[PDB]
Amino acid sequence: YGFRPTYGVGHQPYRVVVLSFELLHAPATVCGPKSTNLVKNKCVNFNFN
Amino acid sequence: KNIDGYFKIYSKHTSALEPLVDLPIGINITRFQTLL
């Protein structure tokens, strides 16, 4: 190619990153992200894992 | 122990045995062999 900093706007190097997802018959150990504070002595709703 | 989703290992050194590892490796182990 021979990229140079004196080219135009379409003849510049661009770094493209592609992310592929896979889901098969195997445990899923890769998840995504959300934790709140703790209150006591009150009738509230909780969620512990 | 390995039931279709994990490979459990129990151990205790001097009684009941406590869990040690919970590897999620899913394979088709059929035979057993140790090395000295």
Curated annotation (Swiss-Prot), chain A:
Chain segments carrying region Disordered: 25-46
Domain of life of the native organism: Viruses
Quaternary assembly: Binds to host ACE2. RBD also interacts with the N-linked glycan on 'Asn-90' of ACE2. Cleavage of S generates a polybasic C-terminal sequence on S1 that binds to host Neuropilin-1 (NRP1) and Neuropilin-2 (NRP2) receptors. Interacts with host integrin alpha-5/beta-1 (ITGA5:ITGB1) and with ACE2 in complex with integrin alpha-5/beta-1 (ITGA5:ITGB1). May interact via cytoplasmic c-terminus with M protein. May interact (via N-terminus) with host bilirubin and biliverdin, thereby preventing antibody binding to the SARS-CoV-2 spike NTD via an allosteric mechanism.
Role, per record: Attaches the virion to the cell membrane by interacting with host receptor, initiating the infection. The major receptor is host ACE2. When S2/S2' has been cleaved, binding to the receptor triggers direct fusion at the cell membrane. When S2/S2' has not been cleaved, binding to the receptor results in internalization of the virus by endocytosis using host TFRC and GRM2 and leading to fusion of the virion membrane with the host endosomal membrane. Alternatively, may use NRP1/NRP2 and integrin as entry receptors.
Name under which the protein is recorded: Spike protein S1
Organism annotation: Severe acute respiratory syndrome coronavirus 2 (2019-nCoV)
Taxonomic path: Viruses, Riboviria, Orthornavirae, Pisuviricota, Pisoniviricetes
Full protein stretch here: 495 to 544 of 1273
